[PDB]
Amino acid sequence: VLSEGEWQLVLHVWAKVEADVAGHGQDILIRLFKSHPETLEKFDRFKHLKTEAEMKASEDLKKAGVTVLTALGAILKKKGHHEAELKPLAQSHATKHKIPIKYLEFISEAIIHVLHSRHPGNFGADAQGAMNKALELFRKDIAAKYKELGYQG
């Protein structure tokens, strides 16, 4: 369970993300697909992308990044009261997309890496700890839903 102070560290960095969600999404997805290339195999619309330059040039990838970060942002703004938002996401990621918890860990890593790089003003140690706790909560709750849905994750 996060504190309000922890939530405020999360939401204060998120506010900067929201200056340019699309740009942050490109950096985060490039980081994920570079660090864990296997994750790209899950995407029929993206698995062909060969290089960072191709990724940066993909209007579809840019749109996807906006989608992902906006969904995550809506979850974070619930400050842990995100049962409603997690239902459809868990169901789709468990049943249609088949996304293991390990891969959710990988994108969490990618998010933290990019925020640390772009936002040293709002992403010191305490803020990073807060964001790691928020993302751990997200993954813990998703994994519990996966189990309910019949997916081991």
Swiss-Prot record:
Heme b binds at H93. The modification Phosphothreonine is found at T67. GO terms for biological process: removal of superoxide radicals. GO terms for molecular function: heme binding; metal ion binding; nitrite reductase activity; oxygen binding; oxygen carrier activity; peroxidase activity. Nitrite binds at A64. PROSITE patterns: GLOBIN. It is found in: Cytoplasm, Sarcoplasm. The keyword Signal does not apply. It is an enzyme of class 1 (oxidoreductase). O2 binds at A64. Its EC number is 1.7.-.-, 1.11.1.-. It comes from the Eukaryota. It catalyses: Fe(III)-heme b-[protein] + nitric oxide + H2O = Fe(II)-heme b-[protein] + nitrite + 2 H(+); H2O2 + AH2 = A + 2 H2O. The modification Phosphoserine is found at S3. Keywords: Cytoplasm, Heme, Iron, Metal-binding, Muscle protein, Oxidoreductase, Oxygen transport, Phosphoprotein, Transport. One of its GO terms (cellular component) is sarcoplasm. InterPro entries: Globin, Globin-like_sf, Myoglobin. Residues 1-147 form the Globin domain. Monomeric heme protein which primary function is to store oxygen and facilitate its diffusion within muscle tissues. Reversibly binds oxygen through a pentacoordinated heme iron and enables its timely and efficient release as needed during periods of heightened demand. Depending on the oxidative conditions of tissues and cells, and in addition to its ability to bind oxygen, it also has a nitrite reductase activity whereby it regulates the production of bioactive nitric oxide. Belongs to the globin family. Monomeric. This is Myoglobin. The lineage of its organism: Eukaryota, Metazoa, Chordata, Craniata, Vertebrata. The gene is MB.
